[PDB]
Design a protein around this ligand. Structure first.
Ligand SMILES: *C[C@@](*)(O)[C@H](CCCNC(N)=[NH2+])NC(=O)[C@@H]1CCCN1C(=O)[C@H](N)Cc1ccccc1
Ligand SMILES: *[C@@H]1O[C@H](CO)[C@@H](O)[C@H](O)[C@H]1NC(C)=O
Length: 234
């Protein structure tokens, strides 16, 4: 994330970090949903995902840090593009659950649908300048801007797709490489999964795309419950 600071150590207990069995670099984040389920971006998928929960600093371990691996991964299959980017979202089922604690806590799924001009916060362990990865997660605040801004810049995001266009129109504040799959939090609920935006990050007049979690609420809840024939919202 760019144009923000270190996150308060207790503000991100649902933030999980994704890296691969082969590499220690965080390639994406995600959100803990209940003891056994993480929500994240489809393009974050890889062959041997590892998930670190209850982390803040890459270097100073926490009491309650946990490493997990996937047992199930679940996608939208009815997507407007073969690569599935128009609907960048995925659910992972953890091999063993976790137990909650100060730094491990389920985020809250939206309840009402919130829109343009709301105040939202972004977090993650992705890039903070031109080529640096911070060792602690950074956070800042953005707003939902009007979709119009995103459409023209991102083909994979058609008009009236299920996304929130968000950022700071003037530059400085935005997510970046490696933030994918991390929550966009508004009124203490996850309204957003980081999908993408422009490279380099936070450039003038160039908001980013967040999968509108609220739309997938039912899809998410069937998937959790055990249903395997359910489809993503059209
Ligand atoms: C995979 C994620 O780390 C990453 C999120 C980066 C978002 N950054 C900014 N500036 N807000 N997503 C990207 O790499 C995604 C997946 C691959 C393509 N992509 C992009 O951001 C492209 N530049 C195009 C894009 C795809 C989907 C939605 C919007 C834009
Ligand atoms: C499974 O999937 C769909 C959800 O729309 C539906 O046909 C069915 O009611 C679901 N429930 C169960 C218990 O299989």
């Amino acid at each position: 994330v760019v144009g923000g600071d270190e996150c308060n150590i207790n503000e991100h207990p649902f933030l999980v970090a994704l890296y691969t069995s082969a590499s220690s670099t965080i390639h994406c984040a995600g959100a803990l949903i209940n003891r056994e389920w993480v929500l994240t971006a489809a393009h974050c998928d890889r062959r041997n995902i590892r998930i670190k929960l209850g982390m803040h600093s890459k270097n100073i371990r926490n009491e309650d840090e946990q490493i997990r691996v996937p047992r199930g991964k679940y996608f939208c299959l009815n997507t407007k593009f073969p690569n599935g980017l128009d609907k960048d979202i995925m659910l992972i089922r953890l091999r063993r659950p976790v137990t909650y604690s100060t730094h491990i806590a389920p985020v809250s799924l939206p309840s009402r649908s919130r829109g343009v001009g709301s105040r939202c916060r972004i977090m993650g362990w992705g890039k903070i300048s031109t080529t640096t990865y911070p060792d602690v997660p950074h956070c800042t605040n953005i707003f939902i801007v009007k979709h119009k801004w995103c459409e023209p810049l991102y083909p994979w995001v058609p008009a009236d797709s299920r996304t929130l266009c968000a950022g700071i129109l003037k530059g400085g504040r935005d997510t970046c490489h490696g933030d994918s799959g991390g929550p966009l939090i508004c009124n203490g609920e996850m309204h957003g999964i980081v999908a993408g935006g422009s490279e380099p990050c936070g450039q003038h007049l160039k908001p980013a795309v967040y999968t509108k979690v609220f739309d997938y609420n039912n899809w998410i809840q069937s998937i959790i419950a055990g249903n395997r024939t359910v489809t993503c919202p059209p």
